[PDB]
Design a protein around this ligand. Structure first.
Ligand SMILES: C[C@H](O)COCC(COC[C@@H](C)O)(COC[C@@H](C)O)COC[C@@H](C)O
Ligand SMILES: C[C@H](O)COCC(COC[C@@H](C)O)(COC[C@@H](C)O)COC[C@@H](C)O
Ligand SMILES: N[P@]1(=O)C=CNC(=O)N1
Ligand SMILES: N[P@]1(=O)C=CNC(=O)N1
Ligand SMILES: [Zn+2]
Ligand SMILES: [Zn+2]
Ligand SMILES: [Zn+2]
Ligand SMILES: [Zn+2]
Lengths: 422, 422
C-alpha cells in the first residue's frame, strides 16, 4: 500500500518533490526541502524523473510478431507489406491473435506504456482478430487502457462488404472508426469512404483515426477531407489523421493554405518515425526523401502531433521492442528537432500530446488524477532521451506494475570505475 | 589469468564454442558438445555472441563534450558547426582537451570499442589539441588503440600556414593525413589540397582519411580525385573517404562511372548516420533528402564501407553515448538495409569493415590473434541490434577491461514475470 513517492523530479520544476497517494489517486504534490530518507509505504524515485505514463497512439496488435510468416516483405514497401499480411491474415486464429497481442502488450507494460491504441484489420468476413482483440482489451485492462480501431485495411469501398464489416465492428464494440483512403481504388472512393467513416462515428458516437495519405504521392490530399468533415461536425478533438506522409511531398503554398484548416479543425496527428523512415522514399533512387509528415511545422503552429511505434516485428517492420524513447529518438533525428530544448521537450510527443490524441481525461501528474505515473532514472527529458533509459518503476492506480533494475557498467582501468555515461 | 572463454556463440556458426587463451593470444577455438559448467580461469559467455571488438573509425575527440560552449549551433548545419567550433577552439587548453577526450574514451571502453580513429583539428598555429592527443594516445593504449588524423578543419590552402601546420602535425606523430576539399575556398584549392595530402602521406608513410564532399552539392566530386590519386600511387588500402554525403545527390550515370574507379582504387568509405541525418538536408524545404552516402550500393559492389559515430555532444551533434549499435541502428534505417539478413550482418559495418578501414592487422576471432574480443548478451547480430544490448564483457590481451551487468525487468501481472523482450 504505497502512500508516497519521494525524491522525485518533475519536468520544468526545480528541486525534489513528494507525491502523496490516497485511494489510488494523487492527493497532493509538495516540494521537498532536501533528499528524504526511505520510509515504509514510500516509493523512492531516487531523484529520477516522474511523468505520466507513456502512450502508444498507433500500433497493430493483430499483426505483431508475424514478420516472415509465411513470406518476408522483400521490397520494404507499404504495398508489399499489405500483400504479405493478406497471406498471413488467411492463417489467423483466435488463439494466435491473442497470444501475439499479449506478447507485445507485456513488452509495453515493461516499457511504462499504460495507454495503447491498436488498429485491427476488419477487412475480414469473420472479424476474427477484431473479436479476439475486444477480449484482450478486457483482459489487459488492469495494466493498459486499450483502444481498438476498426481498421479496414483493404478499403471500405474497395473490399467486398467492407462498409458492413466496418459497421459490425463498431456494433461489437470498437472504440474508433478507421479508414485508408489512399489505398481505395480511386480518389472518388477515397473521398466517399471518409464520408461513410464520419457518418458511422456520429451514428455510434465513436472516435475516428484514419490511415491518411501514407504514400509518397504529392496528389494524395485526403487529409483536407478529414479535417473539413471534422470541422463541419464540430468534432475535432475526436479525430486523428495518422501518417500523412504525403505531406512531406506537398508544395509549400498548398501546405500553407491547408494548415489554416488543420488548425481550425482541431484534429490530431500521429507520425510513426521508425516505420515511416523504412517504408517511405522506397520509390526514389537518389536523392531519397525522408517521408515523415511536417512535425516541426505542426508544432510551430500549435497543431497537436505525436509519435507512434506502428509496427512490432511484422510485415511492415522487422524490428522493435515497443519502446517509445526509441521511437522519439528516431523522430527527433529525422524531423531535425535537434535543439537542446526541442530534445528536452521531446517527452511531450510520447506522453501529453499522445494522451490528447486518444482523448484521455484522466492523465497527468496532478491532484485528483489516478495515480498512474512512471519513474525514469534520468535528470530530465534530454538525459532520458540521450541515454535511452529504461523505466525504473511503472505505477498504476497507486500500485507498482513494472520495475527495471538498471544495467551496471564498470571499466577496469588502473582501478575499477563505474560508468554512468554522464 | 583467464585461460578459456566457454559457452560462446559465433556469427554464422552452429552451437556453442570454447575459446582457449594463452599468453594474451587466442590459442584454439573448439566446438562444444553442450553447455559447459563454469570452471576456474574460465569466462562464461553464457551463450552470448563473441565478436572482435567494436571499432570507431571516425570521431572528433578534440571537440567532444563542448556542445553549447560558448554558443549553440542554432541552424544544425555543418557550416555553423564550424563557426561555433572556431569560437570554442580559441578557448582550448591542454588540460581541457585531455579531460574531455578521456571522458568520451571511457564511455567507448565501456561500450566494447578497442580501436578508435580520432580526427584532431590542426588549423591552429599552436597545435594544442594535436599535441595533447598524442599524449592521450599513449595513455589509453592499454585499453584502446587510438589513431590520430591531422585534420585541417579550416582548409589546407584556405587557412594561414595550413600546409606547414599539417606537415608539422605529421612530423610530431599523427598517424593519418586529413583534408577537407569541399570547405576550401575554390574547387581548384580543393583539388590541389588533395595533391598536397597525398604527397605528405607518401613522404611520411602515413594513412589518409579525407572529410570528402560532406555537403548536399551535386557538383562536389572530390571523391574522384581521392580515388584516382590512391589508384595512381597503388595505396588504396591506406586511404579512406569519410562522409561523401554529396554522393546521395549525384545523378545515377555519373555514379555508375565513378563506381568503377572506386572499386579499382580499393579505398575505404565511412558513413556517419547519426550526424549525417542531422546535418544533411538542412537546405531543403520539403521533400527533404536523407543525405547519407550510397552505402547499399557500395555493399552490393564489394566496396568497403563502415559506420562511425563522428561526434559526441559537440557543435555538430547534441547527443550520443558513443554507442556503435546505436549508430548501426540509425544507419540500417536511413539506408533502408532492413532485410533480415542485412540487419543480422549489420555487425560487420561496425567491426570487420571498420577494422579494414583502419588498416588493422591483428583483428578477428582466430588462433594466433591477440585475445581482443567482446561478448554480447544476444543470440546473433539481429538480436543484438534489435534489443540494443550492452557489452557483457570486453576482453583485451586476455584480460577483462569492462563488464556490464544487464538490466533486469519485471512486470507484476497475476504473478511477477521477467521480461527479456524475446
Ligand atoms: C507471454 C504471453 O504471450 C502469454 O501470456 C498468457 C496470457 C494468458 O491470459 C490470461 C487471461 C487474462 O485470461 C496473458 O498473460 C498472462 C496474464 C496473467 O496477464 C495470454 O495467452 C493467450 C492464450 C491463452 O491464447
Ligand atoms: C573521468 C575522466 O574524464 C578523467 O580521468 C582521469 C584521467 C587521468 O589520467 C591519468 C594518466 C593516464 O596519466 C584518465 O583516466 C584515468 C586513468 C587511470 O585511465 C585523465 O585526466 C585528464 C587530466 C589530468 O587533464
Ligand atoms: N504502416 P501501417 O500503418 C501498418 C499496417 N497497415 C497499413 O496500411 N499501414
Ligand atoms: N561532421 P564533421 O565530420 C565534425 C567536425 N567537422 C567537420 O567538418 N565535419
Ligand atoms: Zn474468445
Ligand atoms: Zn498503422
Ligand atoms: Zn602534456
Ligand atoms: Zn568528422
Amino acid at each position: 500500500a504505497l502512500q508516497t513517492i519521494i525524491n522525485a523530479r518533475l519536468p520544468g520544476e526545480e528541486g525534489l518533490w513528494q507525491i502523496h497517494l490516497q485511494d489510488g489517486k494523487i492527493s497532493a504534490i509538495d516540494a521537498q526541502s532536501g533528499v528524504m530518507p526511505i520510509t515504509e509505504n514510500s516509493l523512492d524515485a531516487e531523484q529520477g524523473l516522474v511523468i505520466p505514463p507513456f502512450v502508444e497512439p498507433h500500433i497493430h496488435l493483430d499483426t505483431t510478431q508475424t514478420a516472415g510468416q509465411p513470406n518476408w516483405n522483400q521490397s520494404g514497401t507499404l504495398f508489399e507489406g499489405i500483400e504479405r499480411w493478406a497471406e498471413r491474415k488467411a492463417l489467423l486464429t483466435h488463439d494466435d491473435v491473442k497470444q501475439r497481442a499479449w506478447q507485445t502488450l507485456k513488452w509495453q507494460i515493461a516499457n511504462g506504456i499504460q495507454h495503447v491504441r491498436t488498429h485491427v484489420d476488419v477487412s475480414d468476413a469473420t472479424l476474427t482478430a477484431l473479436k479476439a482483440m475486444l477480449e484482450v482489451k478486457q483482459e489487459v485492462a488492469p495494466w493498459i487502457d486499450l483502444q481498438i480501431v476498426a481498421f479496414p485495411q483493404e478499403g471500405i469501398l474497395s473490399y467486398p462488404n467492407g462498409e458492413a464489416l466496418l459497421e459490425e465492428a463498431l456494433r461489437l464494440g470498437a472504440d474508433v472508426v478507421g479508414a485508408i483512403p489512399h489505398f481505395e481504388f480511386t480518389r472518388e472512393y477515397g473521398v466517399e469512404s471518409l464520408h461513410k467513416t464520419f457518418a458511422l462515428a456520429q451514428k455510434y458516437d465513436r472516435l475516428i483515426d484514419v490511415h491518411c495519405d501514407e504514400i509518397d504521392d504529392e496528389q494524395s490530399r485526403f487529409v483536407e477531407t478529414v479535417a473539413a468533415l471534422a470541422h463541419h461536425e464540430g468534432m475535432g478533438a475526436r479525430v486523428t489523421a495518422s501518417h500523412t506522409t504525403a505531406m512531406h511531398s506537398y508544395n509549400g503554398a498548398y501546405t500553407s493554405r491547408l494548415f489554416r484548416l488543420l488548425k481550425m479543425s482541431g484534429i490530431n496527428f500521429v507520425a510513426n518515425p521508425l516505420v515511416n523512415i523504412h517504408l517511405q522514399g522506397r520509390f526514389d533512387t537518389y536523392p531519397k526523401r525522408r517521408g515523415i509528415t511536417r512535425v516541426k511545422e505542426m508544432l510551430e503552429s500549435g497543431i497537436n502531433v505525436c509519435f507512434g511505434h506502428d509496427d512490432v516485428f511484422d510485415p511492415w517492420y522487422p524490428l522493435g521492442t515497443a519502446n517509445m524513447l526509441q521511437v522519439l529518438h528516431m523522430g527527433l533525428h529525422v524531423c531535425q528537432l535537434m535543439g537542446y530544448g526541442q530534445i528536452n521537450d521531446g517527452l511531450n510527443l510520447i506522453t501529453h500530446h499522445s494522451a490528447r490524441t486518444l482523448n484521455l481525461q484522466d492523465y497527468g501528474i496532478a491532484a485528483g488524477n489516478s495515480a498512474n505515473l512512471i519513474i525514469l532514472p534520468a535528470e530530465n527529458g534530454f538525459d532520458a532521451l540521450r541515454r535511452q533509459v529504461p523505466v525504473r518503476y511503472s505505477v498504476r492506480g497507486g500500485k507498482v506494475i513494472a520495475s527495471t533494475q538498471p544495467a551496471q557498467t564498470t571499466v577496469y582501468l588502473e582501478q575499477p570505475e563505474a560508468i554512468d555515461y554522464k
